[PDB]
Write a protein that binds this ligand. Structure first.
Ligand SMILES: Cc1ccccc1-c1cn2c(n1)C[C@H](NC(=O)c1c(C(=O)N3CCC3)cnn1C)CC2
Ligand SMILES: [Mg+2]
Ligand SMILES: [Zn+2]
Length: 313
C-alpha cells in the first residue's frame, strides 16, 4: 500500500513528456509501466501482487520479432499515459484502468505479419476471424491471461464495471486495426467541424478512444528523429520478411514489403505521414488540445524525411 515505484531523476521528469523513449534496459520496463499505472490510476487501482503477475504473463506472450514486441507494448502504453495525464478530468476511473492495459495487451502474440499475409497464407486465425484478424487474436489472448489463477487485476470491480472495462479494452484493441482508422477519423473530423461531437455520447467517446489508440500505436513518428529513424528499421525488418514470405507463396509483394525497393522508403514515409500520421494527430489535437506536442513532433519528423529525399541526410 505505502510501496511506490520511484524512477531515477532523469526518467521521473522525461517520462511525463510525450517524446520519452523507455530505453534499452528491458528489466526496467515492468517498473516503468507500474509507475505509470500508479500515477495515472492510483496505487489502489490494482493489487500489486496480481498486476506484477499479469505484466510478466503479458511479456512472456509477446514474441522476439523486430518491432511487434514487448518494447512496442510498453512504448504504446507510455504514449497513452502521457495523453491521460495531460487530459486529467476528461476520462472516467474505469477508462484510465482499461486503456493502459489495452495498450500493453494490444499486440499480444504478434508473429510480425499483417492480416493480409495471414489471409493469403490461409492461416487458421483467418478462418476464426475474417476481419481485424490479429486484433481479435490480441483481445482473445488478453482475456486468456486475465483468467489465469492469480492474474485477474479487475477482480475488485463490480460485475457491471467488469463488463464495461472488458468492452473498453476490446474496442480499444480492435481500433488498432489501421484499416478501421481512415473511416473512424473521417467520422470524427465531420463531428468536430459540424459541432455535433458530444463526449457524453458513448458511441462518440468510443470513436475518440479509437483515435487515441491509433495515436499511441503510431507514436514512433512523435519521438526524437534518431528514435523515429531507428524504429523504422525494425518496422521494415518485419515488412521485408513478410515480402520474402509473399515471394515464397508465388506473389510479388507491394513495394513496402519488397526489400529490393529500399530506395523508395523515404517517399513511402512521406505518403504515410500525409495520409495517416499528420491527419491522426491533427484531429486528436482538435478534440484534446493538450496532445498538440504529438502533432508538432510528427511534423518535425515529416520535415526530417523530406530532408532525407533532398540528400541532406
Ligand atoms: C509505398 C512504399 C514504397 C517503397 C517502400 C516503402 C513504401 C511504404 C509505404 N508505407 C510505408 N512504406 C510505411 C508505412 N507505415 C509506417 O511507416 C508505420 C507503421 C505501420 O504502417 N504499421 C502497420 C504495422 C505497423 C507503424 N508506424 N509506422 C511509422 C505504411 C505505408
Ligand atoms: Mg497491432
Ligand atoms: Zn501496435
Amino acid at each position: 500500500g505505502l510501496m511506490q515505484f520511484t524512477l531515477p531523476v532523469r526518467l521521473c521528469k522525461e517520462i511525463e513528456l510525450f517524446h520519452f523513449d523507455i530505453g534499452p534496459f528491458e528489466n526496467m520496463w515492468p517498473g516503468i509501466f507500474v509507475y505509470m499505472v500508479h500515477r495515472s490510476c492510483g496505487t489502489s487501482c490494482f493489487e500489486l501482487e496480481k498486476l506484477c503477475r499479469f505484466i510478466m504473463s503479458v511479456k512472456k506472450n509477446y514474441r522476439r520479432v523486430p518491432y511487434h514486441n514487448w518494447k512496442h507494448a510498453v512504448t504504446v502504453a507510455h504514449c497513452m499515459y502521457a495523453i491521460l495525464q495531460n487530459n486529467h478530468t476528461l476520462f472516467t476511473d474505469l477508462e484510465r484502468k482499461g486503456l493502459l492495459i489495452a495498450c500493453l495487451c494490444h499486440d499480444l502474440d504478434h508473429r510480425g505479419f499483417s492480416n493480409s499475409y495471414l489471409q493469403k497464407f490461409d492461416h487458421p486465425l483467418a478462418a476464426l476471424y475474417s476481419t481485424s484478424t490479429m486484433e481479435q487474436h490480441h483481445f482473445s489472448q488478453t482475456v486468456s491471461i486475465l483468467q489465469l489463477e492469480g492474474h485477474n487485476i479487475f477482480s475488485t470491480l463490480s460485475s457491471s464495471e467488469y463488463e464495461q472495462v472488458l468492452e473498453i479494452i476490446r474496442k480499444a484493441i480492435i481500433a488498432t486495426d489501421l484499416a478501421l482508422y481512415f473511416g473512424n477519423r473521417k467520422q470524427l473530423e465531420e463531428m468536430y467541424q459540424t459541432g455535433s461531437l458530444n463526449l457524453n455520447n458513448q458511441s462518440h467517446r468510443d470513436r475518440v478512444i479509437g483515435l487515441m489508440m491509433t495515436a499511441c500505436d503510431l507514436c514512433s513518428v512523435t519521438k526524437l528523429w534518431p528514435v523515429t529513424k531507428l524504429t523504422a528499421n525494425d518496422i521494415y525488418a518485419e515488412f521485408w520478411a513478410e515480402g520474402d514470405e509473399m515471394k515464397k507463396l508465388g506473389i510479388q509483394p507491394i513495394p513496402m514489403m519488397d526489400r529490393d525497393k529500399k530506395d523508395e522508403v523515404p517517399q513511402g514515409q512521406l505518403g504515410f505521414y500525409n495520409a495517416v500520421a499528420i491527419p491522426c494527430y491533427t484531429t486528436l489535437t482538435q478534440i484534446l488540445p493538450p496532445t498538440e506536442p504529438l502533432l508538432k513532433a510528427c511534423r518535425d519528423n515529416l520535415s526530417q524525411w523530406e530532408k532525407v529525399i533532398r540528400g541532406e541526410e
